[PDB]
Amino acid sequence: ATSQPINFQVQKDGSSEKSHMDDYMQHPGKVIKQNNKYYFQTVLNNASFWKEYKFYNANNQELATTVVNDNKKADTRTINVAVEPGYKSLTTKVHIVVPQINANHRYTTHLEFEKAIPTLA
Ligand code: HEM
């Protein structure tokens, strides 16, 4: 296995309640192994709304992210977040701007994997 699907749910700051941020990421994501390193690849819908995003492990280490696909037409963006096997969540901090309802906000949420990122290959 070079990769495997991994489902997740983005949940609200301070609880296990689903966050409506979950509605703007494709499901499942994917765990990808390259050489000795692991990536969580995920697709952001309504990419133009995500003005900033940072991901952290549960020990508050910022995780490197790369853009691997920007699709202007579909308004999506595919990103690779650096992870390790064993992570059960990521903390996200995002700056979201929604024109139609004049919204400009920063939020913190926690993305919860269906299970610990597995070792592969
Ligand atoms: C499609 C246009 C969107 C509309 C009309 C919308 C609307 C709203 C409204 C009215 C609230 C409650 C007030 C507030 O705290 O701001 C809210 C909360 C929130 N929104 Fe959005 N939103 C949109 C897109 C997004 C996107 C793309 C994200 C990022 C993935 C996002 C993430 C959040 C988060 C994290 C909250 C806090 C409550 C929760 O965690 O569910 N929203 N949104």
Look up residue 33 and give its amino acid: K
Q: In Å, what is the CA distance from 30 to each residue of 78, 80, 112?
A: 11, 9, 14
Q: What is the resolution of this structure in A?
A: 2.0
Domain 1-121 belongs in CATH node 3.40.50.300: no
- Asked if 38 and 84 count as a contact pair (C-beta separation under 8 A), the reply is yes
- Going from N- to C-terminal start, the domains of the chain cover 1-121
- Asked if 71 and 36 count as a contact pair (C-beta separation under 8 A), the reply is no
Q: What is the C-alpha to C-alpha distance for residues 53 and 46, in angstroms, rounded to an integer?
A: 13
Q: In Å, what is the CA distance from 107 to each residue of 22, 30, 52, 53, 97?
A: 13, 24, 10, 10, 11
Q: What is the C-alpha to C-alpha distance for residues 46 and 74, in angstroms, rounded to an integer?
A: 8
> What is the best residue among 96, 104, 109, 111 to mutate for testing ligand 1's pocket, by most ligand atoms within 8 Å of CB?
96
By alpha-carbon position, which residue is closest to atom 3 of ligand 1? 98
- Which ligand 1 atom sits closest to the C-alpha of 24? 30
- Asked if 7 and 28 count as a contact pair (C-beta separation under 8 A), the reply is yes
* Strands annotated E in the chain: 3-6, 8-12, 29-34, 37-45, 50-56, 62-63, 65-71, 76-83, 89-98, 103-113
Torsion angles phi and psi, residue 86, rounded to 5? 110, -25
